[PDB]
Amino acid sequence: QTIYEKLGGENAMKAAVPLFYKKVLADERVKHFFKNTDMDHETKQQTDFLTMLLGGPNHYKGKNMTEAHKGMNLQNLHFDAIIENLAATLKELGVTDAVINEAAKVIEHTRKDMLGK
Ligand code: HEM
């Protein structure tokens, strides 16, 4: 009963991260930010990061949230879009609203680290 376990553990996270990128890369609000991104790299880092954040194994060796988005001057509407797409991903994968909300509540603490950097 970590959030990572409630979502379904490793095979669930490996399905969810590429589906979340499929939605992000179709969302007019944010897709363009990824134009020059190595999507294999990025899928791996984000899988490691959400796995760590949500109480699974901690193998995240990437940048902190300010460094990751430095120079992007991200705005609130961009962060809302990312949360909406992760929520829609987990809902499409059959996750209940209560578990989506627990996950979102953890991720939402990162907003101040990345906006306006
Ligand atoms: C606010 C809207 C956001 C936008 C537009 C965005 C966009 C990006 C982009 C474009 C990169 C890659 C730069 C590159 O390597 O090509 C990146 C890195 C990353 N972002 Fe975001 N991001 C956002 C929010 C989030 C959130 C909410 C999280 C997780 C909670 C997240 C986690 C990460 C991670 C783990 C990396 C990888 C850092 C590394 O490579 O070491 N981001 N982001």
Swiss-Prot record:
PROSITE patterns: GLOBIN_FAM_2 (PS01213). Its cofactor is heme. InterPro entries: Globin-like_sf (IPR009050), Globin/Proto (IPR012292), Globin_bac-like_CS (IPR019795), Hemoglobin_trunc (IPR001486), Hemoglobin_trunc_I (IPR016339). The keyword Heme applies. Binds 1 heme group per subunit. Keywords: Acetylation, Heme, Iron, Metal-binding, Oxygen transport, Transport. Heme binds at H69. Gene3D superfamilies: Globins. GO terms for molecular function: heme binding; metal ion binding; oxygen binding; oxygen carrier activity. Pfam families: Bac_globin. Belongs to the truncated hemoglobin family. Group I subfamily. Monomer. This is Group 1 truncated hemoglobin. It comes from Tetrahymena pyriformis. The lineage of its organism: Eukaryota, Sar, Alveolata, Ciliophora, Intramacronucleata.
